[PDB]
């Protein structure tokens, strides 16, 4: 064989080049920095009304409005300050697995096992929330819808590929292929130039929204990756797999920056998010709880202890004032 | 605060509609249709009347939502937990493919799929309604092809009844939570229109069993 040998040697020499020039690990430089102690957060608000498993949530761009998707086919927009239900949207498919809040607040795109990303318009003249458009073209379940602007959105799927859409036309503008497993998460860069998607093939990939080319590939996990998010500066990203290991990779170093695992945790990570400063990486775990890791010292500097079921989703506001967590016990809790 | 006082009222109305929707949704039966593809689940779907296909039907004032996920073509480990809470799992197995092969024959495919589903961690308190398709074709085929081709340890006459009973028992032995969950076997009929009645009886028994487990006498 020729292609197999060529691919093997390319991988071998690129890995050798990456390892040989690596200077030192993250801890070797960040050891001298004092820790943060214990991040003690208390439930300021508890949002009730979902009557099934909560699978996703997304913060509004104003750090006050929230959208949450539940397994009973309900999409609820909450007022986070006063726990008022701003909107209630009946989904056509009850098997919703992800969804997001538009950066302008006018739209919400949401979907799941129905192979469709349904997009709903909030600021209508009719006083309700109408379905703006159904984006179809995926042959596997849908994950991590994320609006770029009012008319452009990227979605990952179980088709081993991601898709950049055009909501005005409804056609798949760009297709990103190359994964060898179910792509379970994606996260948009802050500057709307790149994004990263983690798949069930235990790898993440950095893709360009305008060129559609495989810019980077990132390995290091042993099982499927469930969640991914960008560092706020757009030069790093954190993944969480079923291995129960959270890993921080650098987009430019091409090597994992740090591991965020501990011996006591056996169940994998369900959701991952950062604080505004990029100092507190929050990770919602499979057992019952959420861990607040010090994203520089890899120490559990705080635990959110509620959520009598599996914590499915996390979210941090743009200003960082609060953190909303959704779990499988049908309860959204806001921590500050 | 007048605007806030109206917003609280709007949220209260929204919450009461949510409560009503939950009350309505808790009063319906959820079935997860599973099979090996060549097991003729389409026949079951027809007798009841891409991605996930929902079939809604009413029988004896009981509402049934049956979810077919045969057109997913993805790793079940990522979305099977979404069905934790279904009333029952309707499994379909063909009896004609005991000799036909897909390497390995399709009957072992169906048996190991059944073993995987029945012993799933998300499926411990959920019952399985097992359907055996191609009754006439299986009866006619064994007159020339012995069941020994599939099961080498089988010892019995190549008749429909003994072979079918052996196959049912072999499927039964795959269960490991013999006291937690229960397996409900049926042989599919064409013109009798009894499959829906069997599903109704099975789901009724499941509901009664859950009520008894709740009460504390049982």
């Amino acid at each position, epitope marked *: 064989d020729q292609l197999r040998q060529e691919a093997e040697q390319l991988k071998n020499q690129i890995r050798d080049a990456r390892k040989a020039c690596a200077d030192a690990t993250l801890s070797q430089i960040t050891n001298n920095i004092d820790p943060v102690g214990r991040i003690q957060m208390r439930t300021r608000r508890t949002l009730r009304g979902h009557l099934a498993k909560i699978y996703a949530m997304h913060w509004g761009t104003d750090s006050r*409005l929230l959208v949450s998707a539940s397994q009973d086919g309900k999409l609820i927009i909450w007022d986070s*300050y006063t726990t008022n239900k701003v909107h209630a949207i009946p989904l056509r498919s009850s098997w919703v697995m992800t969804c997001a809040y538009a950066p302008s607040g006018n739209y919400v795109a949401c979907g799941g096992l129905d192979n469709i990303c349904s997009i709903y318009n909030l600021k209508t003249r*009719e*006083g309700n929330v109408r379905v703006s458009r159904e984006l179809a073209g995926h042959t596997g379940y849908l994950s991590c819808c994320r609006f770029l602007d009012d008319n452009q959105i990227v979605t990952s799927s179980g088709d081993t590929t991601c898709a950049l859409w055009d909501i005005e036309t409804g056609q798949q503008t760009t297709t990103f292929t190359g994964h060898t497993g179910d792509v379970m998460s994606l996260s948009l860069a802050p500057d709307t130039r790149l994004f990263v998607s983690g798949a069930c093939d235990a790898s993440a990939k950095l893709w360009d929204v305008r060129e559609g080319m495989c810019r980077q590939t990132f390995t290091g996990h042993e099982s499927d990756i469930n969640a991914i998010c960008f560092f706020p500066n757009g030069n790093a990203f954190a993944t969480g797999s079923d291995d129960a290991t959270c890993r921080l990779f650098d987009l430019r170093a091409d090597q994992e920056l740090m591991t965020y695992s501990h011996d006591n945790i056996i169940c994998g990570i369900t959701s991952v998010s950062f604080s505004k400063s990029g100092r507190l990486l929050l990770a919602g775990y499979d057992d019952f709880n959420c861990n607040v890791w010090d994203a520089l010292k890899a120490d559990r500097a705080g635990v959110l202890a509620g959520h009598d079921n599996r914590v499915s989703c996390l979210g941090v506001t743009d200003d960082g004032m609060a953190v909303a967590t959704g779990s499988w016990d049908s309860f959204l809790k806001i921590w500050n | 605060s*007048a*605007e806030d006082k*109206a917003a609280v*009222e709007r949220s209260k*109305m929204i919450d009461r509609n949510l409560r009503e929707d939950g009350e309505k949704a808790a009063r319906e039966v959820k079935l997860l249709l599973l099979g090996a593809g060549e097991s003729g689940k389409s026949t079951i779907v027809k007798q009841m009347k891409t991605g996930i296909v929902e079939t809604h039907f009413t029988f004896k004032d009981l509402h049934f939502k049956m979810f077919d996920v045969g057109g997913q073509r993805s790793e079940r480990k990522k979305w099977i937990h979404c069905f934790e809470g279904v009333t029952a799992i309707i499994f379909c197995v063909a009896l004609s493919d005991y000799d036909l092969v897909l390497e390995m024959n399709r009957m072992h495919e169906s048996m190991k799929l059944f073993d995987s589903i029945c012993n799933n961690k998300w499926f411990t308190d959920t019952s399985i309604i097992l359907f055996l398709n191609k009754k006439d074709l299986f009866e006619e085929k064994i007159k020339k092809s012995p069941l020994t081709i599939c099961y080498p340890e089988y010892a019995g006459s190549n008749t429909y009844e003994e072979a079918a009973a052996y196959i049912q028992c072999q499927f039964e032995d795959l269960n490991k939570r013999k006291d937690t969950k229960e397996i409900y076997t049926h042989f599919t009929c064409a013109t009798d229109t009894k499959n829906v009645q069997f599903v109704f009886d099975a789901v009724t028994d499941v509901i009664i069993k859950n009520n008894l487990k709740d009460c504390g006498l049982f």
Partner: single-chain antibody
Amino acid sequence: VQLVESGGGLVQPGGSRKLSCSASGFAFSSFGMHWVRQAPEKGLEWVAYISSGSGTIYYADTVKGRFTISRDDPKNTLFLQMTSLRSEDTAMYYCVRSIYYYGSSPFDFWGQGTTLTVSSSDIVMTQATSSVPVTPGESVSISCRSSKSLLHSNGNTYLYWFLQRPGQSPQLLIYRMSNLASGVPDRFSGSGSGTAFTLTISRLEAEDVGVYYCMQHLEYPLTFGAGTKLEL
């Protein structure tokens, strides 16, 4: 969206009438509804309010207990049943929608109104003048003052700026301080502090003439300003 009123006409004192407001073009069941009135060449004056689901009902203290508010959600019809009519009830009545959640504009759409002729504590909002002449292309600033500080503890100041062109219905321009309504050109702006409030108009065109009104919500009853008429 189309709200159409009916029931107007001429009535004798001591009688009872009924005003109907038919909605067509939006979700009437999800909108609270206000009845407002405007006396001939005098100014606007709020009448009544009914929340979504007919839960909360508010009447103006001057007429409280003498009018009645009814709602038909399966039919999308608003009823104002008026029991006894003096010589002051003669006016043009408007049927306004109002939806209340975080960020909504609760005075967006107004009805066309219906006329009624009868034969013969509360916050005070005062507007500076009643007639200001100006030419197109010149920025105009209108001001009005309140008694209480409308700035609530929420941080929101419940001030509303409306415009009524000659022969037309009122149209919302500002709903808290500087939040432009839907379909209003970006030349208008609003500002102020606590009690003193200013509406500024840059690059004024010929269609911007009419009577401007400043209103406060903040509490019931809702009180309107005098109404400053721009002249050209």
